[PDB]
Ligand binder design. Structure first.
Ligand code: ZK1
Lengths: 489, 147, 49
């Protein structure tokens, strides 16, 4: 038979409802159909969410897809926990252990705390919009004690649309006083586009500035505005476009016309829409495991009223929750596995970074491993260090008190060692001291015509410079270049 | 929700009652919609909400006056979430403006079987700066657990 | 548009716009940022005519 479900969509979730219907037609199978009843409402209103939940509950559904806000999350988790209806959601994962709520959004408290340590920040601003709990602000403040962080938290989300420019430009003038160059933008797309419009306008997208965008949606804003300028911006991505399942999806996603699928004719999908697409895979695969293991369930003749007295559970509901949490699919976001609370485990968050070419994956974060860097750090560039030849003469170069205990240039001291430090500082290179193997200065054999010593290590190619007591001679400057004498004798 | 609707269906003229951080949005949305004015001793709501008459005064202004009065600039702020997080934001907004170094620690996610253990882990991270000035933004029961 | 995009409308930079039409472009784009821009104007809007 077909399976009745419900949908709580916001008024403005055009792409999310478009990606919902795309996932409908792709994961449907002749055996059973997930016939929905879609309600549109505002999710910041707990009266509307109460009234729409009870319309879905009276009209016999088996699970409710939907979104919630800060205002409605406690209406949702209470109704679903009490009436044993399951709720599947792309919204923020709840702060708690709520039954009958399956969270499709992974978590980025752990990944964001790993990335601040990776850049070794210890003083930074944190701009937060309220907007979905306040739990990531609270997670960096609970860690700021034991990680030695000085965090400047600014509420950036009470701002209205007519004093927008005046509030933000006055905001970064305050941080300018404290020399804040490191900022985390814990906002969503529409708010993070407004902030990067203002950091460009007042010239804070230049070098010296670092930005971390604490979304799961790094390449969902307009990053081409801040891509040149010099500021380093970093972020997180759960939708890897360099995967086979995603690239096959973008193929059919980009060809859709924006009359039957608004917000679809493009090559990037928002992560909340990717999780809406993945949630149809999760529901369908779980209702397939419902009819597979012969657990066959009916709703009731009436479903009663949500505000019943007493409101009674229904024993089939525990099975449906347990079936929704055993799902082990692969979706646009990666591995979709839930724990017993309904929160995603075994997931991956790609740590991106904006370069002049574009956004560049510089690693990932897994729950079990940690932040894992990926293989691209081999191709940066390096300094091209300079090999410098010396010789053991006191006091020019002579080995220090502990030869073997020290490693590198620090094995050596003397006049020419202090001279090599001064030549390198003015020219601008990095050097690696090297005693000449033959332990000689350089002379030419009458038969073989081969230059020995530090001279032949410059004539033939072993070295680039010879800082030494090396006498400026006629027969030597025919084959090498001396400077003016640093010591007359 | 069920008990608001039992009194809306008995037809009352106003409702006296309490709310939590979990039920504040249920109350202010129903009373804002069905016009069933709510008189409450609970915490003042974070925003402008119609048909809610709030008998508890406020404390954000009196608390930021007292921090300035003692000339505090480095302190710990131990909070509990149950009255919202409005006063945490108020001392964090005023810390940016006035160069305070607040250590905000959520002390309300602590249960009865991990009290003596995590409280010693609490007061350990205070000794990393040797915090001597502590604000206890909890209610009566939790402030006795800390004292 | 390009000096904003690559961050050269910040302090330290000075620009002279050699038109007779200073307030005929979009100067509100570069007005904050810190760069000093200067120019010329033959049409004084603070005149009676
Ligand atoms: O370029 C040259 N620079 C040299 C520098 C020095 C030193 F003084 F140590 F710096 C000396 N020594 C002189 C005293 O006894 C120890 C070695 C020899 C050098 N020789 C070989 P020489 O001059 O033919 O004997 C060179 O060829």
């Amino acid at each position: 038979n077909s399976i009745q479900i419900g949908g709580l969509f916001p008024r403005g979730a055009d792409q999310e409802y478009s990606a919902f219907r795309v996932g409908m037609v792709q994961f449907s199978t002749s055996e059973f159909r997930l016939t929905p009843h879609i309600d549109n409402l505002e999710v910041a209103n707990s009266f509307a969410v109460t009234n729409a939940f009870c319309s879905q509950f009276s009209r016999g559904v088996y699970a409710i897809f939907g979104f919630y806000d800060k205002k409605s999350v406690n209406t949702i988790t209470s109704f679903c926990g009490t009436l044993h209806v399951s709720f599947i959601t792309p919204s923020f994962p709840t702060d708690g252990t709520h039954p009958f709520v399956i969270q499709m959004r992974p978590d980025l408290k752990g990944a964001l705390l790993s990335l601040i340590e990776y850049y070794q920040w210890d003083k930074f601003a944190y701009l937060y919009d309220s907007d979905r709990g306040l739990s990531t602000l609270q997670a960096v403040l609970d860690s700021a004690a034991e990680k030695k962080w000085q965090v400047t938290a600014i509420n950036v989300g009470n701002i209205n649309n007519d004093k927008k420019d005046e509030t933000y430009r006055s905001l970064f003038q305050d941080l300018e006083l404290k020399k804040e160059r490191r900022v985390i933008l814990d906002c969503e797309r529409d708010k993070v586009n407004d902030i990067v419009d203002q950091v460009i306008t007042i010239g804070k997208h230049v070098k010296g500035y670092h930005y971390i965008i604490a979304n799961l949606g790094f390449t969902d804003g307009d990053l081409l505005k801040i891509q040149f300028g010099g500021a380093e911006v970093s972020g997180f991505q759960i939708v890897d476009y360099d995967d086979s399942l995603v690239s096959k999806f973008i193929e059919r996603w980009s060809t859709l016309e924006e009359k039957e699928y608004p917000g679809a004719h493009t090559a990037t999908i928002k992560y909340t829409s990717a999780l809406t697409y993945d949630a149809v895979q999760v529901m369908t695969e779980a209702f397939r495991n419902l009819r597979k293991q012969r657990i066959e369930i009916s709703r009731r003749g009436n479903a009663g009223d949500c505000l019943a007295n007493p409101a009674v559970p229904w024993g089939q509901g525990v099975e449906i929750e347990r079936a929704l949490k055993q799902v082990q699919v692969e979706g646009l976001s990666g591995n979709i596995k839930f724990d017993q609370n309904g929160k995603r485990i075994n997931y991956t968050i790609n740590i991106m970074e904006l370069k002049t070419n574009g956004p560049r994956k510089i690693g990932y974060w897994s729950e079990v491993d940690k932040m894992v860097l990926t293989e691209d750090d081999t191709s940066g560039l390096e300094q091209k260090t300079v090999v410098v030849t010396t010789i053991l003469e006191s006091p020019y170069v002579m080995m220090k008190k502990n030869h073997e205990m020290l490693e590198g240039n620090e094995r050596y001291e003397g006049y020419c060692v202090d001279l090599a430090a001064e030549i390198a500082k003015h020219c601008g290179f990095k050097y690696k001291l090297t005693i000449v193997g033959d332990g000689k200065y350089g002379a030419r054999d009458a038969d073989t015509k081969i230059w020995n010593g530090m001279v032949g290590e410059l004539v033939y190619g072993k070295a680039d410079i010879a800082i030494a007591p090396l006498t400026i001679t006629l027969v030597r400057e025919e084959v090498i270049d001396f400077s003016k004498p640093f010591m007359s004798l």
